[PDB]
């Protein structure tokens, strides 16, 4: 009756991976990149090192950490009231996939380079 995805079992918030078998929503994407900041910084080679404190695992679960994650995630599904009819929101995975692949973030399952894809 009240299933998630509608009649066609839509899924406009998940991204598939070419390697292994593991998918996650865009909500967990923000936390994954922030946690694995040491690997990204060393890959390329103070103002640059500004998000170092956010790498803490316990800080994210605190009141301050909860607000930081929500600030970056703008909830693209929500929009203006006039966006009705043909002007409906589409899957925002196109932008997320580009950043996740360019940043060269390892997958939790298996340590690999950019292997993410839209799905």
């Amino acid at each position: 009756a009240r299933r998630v995805g509608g009649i066609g079992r839509r899924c406009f918030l998940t991204l598939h991976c070419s390697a292994c078998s593991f998918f996650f929503q865009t909500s967990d994407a923000i936390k994954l990149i922030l946690t694995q900041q040491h690997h990204i910084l060393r890959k390329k080679g103070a103002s640059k090192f500004s998000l170092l404190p956010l790498a803490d695992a316990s800080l994210l679960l605190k009141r301050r950490g909860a607000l930081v994650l929500r600030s970056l995630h703008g909830d693209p599904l929500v929009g203006s009231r006039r966006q009705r009819g043909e002007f409906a929101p589409q899957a925002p995975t196109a932008e997320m996939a580009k950043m996740l692949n360019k940043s060269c973030v390892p997958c939790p399952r298996c340590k690999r380079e950019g292997r993410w894809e839209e799905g």
């Binding site: 009240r2 998630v4 509608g6 839509r10 918030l13 599904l77 929500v78």
Partner: peptide, 26 residues
Amino acid sequence: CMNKKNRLALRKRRRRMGERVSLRYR
């Protein structure tokens, strides 16, 4: 979307797009 009719429509619409929003009150 001020009343319970139009406001609840937004939450139900997002539920069909592959998201889970708490429902519960309002």
